[PDB]
């Protein structure tokens, strides 16, 4: 995608946001045995 | 008391080999299991490659 914004006089950013899910499961199976598994979707951050 | 001196320790006096000595106790040799067959080894390569980032683990049999 591409934008055509009004020209300002000093440089700016473009805060683009992508709607994703961002989920956390967390379980305690044993005393002092805490463990999570993060999974955000589609822009996952855990590949091989 | 000197009637029971077990007379093949006196034969090899100061020359005792391994079968005449009291050893520290311990079991025989069992081979080490395959670390591929660990409970969380392959599934960490599968659940992460689905897109997850993992952190956390279950304590061992010794609880540490």
Automatic annotation (TrEMBL), chain A:
It comes from the Viruses. It is found in: Virion; Host nucleus. Induction: Expressed in the late phase of the viral replicative cycle. Belongs to the adenoviridae hexon protein family. Homotrimer. Major capsid protein that self-associates to form 240 hexon trimers, each in the shape of a hexagon, building most of the pseudo T=25 capsid. Assembled into trimeric units with the help of the chaperone shutoff protein. Transported by pre-protein VI to the nucleus where it associates with other structural proteins to form an empty capsid. Might be involved, through its interaction with host dyneins, in the intracellular microtubule-dependent transport of incoming viral capsid to the nucleus. This is Hexon protein. The chain holds residues 860 to 907 of 909 of the full protein.
UniProtKB/TrEMBL annotation, chain B:
This is Hexon-linking protein-N. It is found in: Virion. The record marks 57-58 as: Cleavage. It comes from the Viruses.
């Amino acid at each position: 995608m591409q934008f055509t914004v009004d020209p300002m006089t000093e440089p700016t950013y473009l805060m683009l946001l992508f709607g994703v899910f961002d989920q956390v499961v967390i379980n305690q199976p044993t005393r002092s045995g805490i463990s999570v598994a993060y999974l955000r979707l589609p822009f996952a951050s855990g590949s091989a | 008391r000197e009637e029971t001196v077990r007379p093949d320790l006196a034969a090899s006096f100061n020359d005792w080999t391994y079968d005449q000595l009291t050893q520290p106790p311990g079991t025989a040799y069992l081979p080490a299991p395959d670390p591929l067959t660990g409970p969380t080894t392959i599934r960490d390569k599968v659940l992460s490659a689905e897109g997850e980032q993992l952190a956390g683990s279950r304590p061992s049999v010794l609880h540490g």
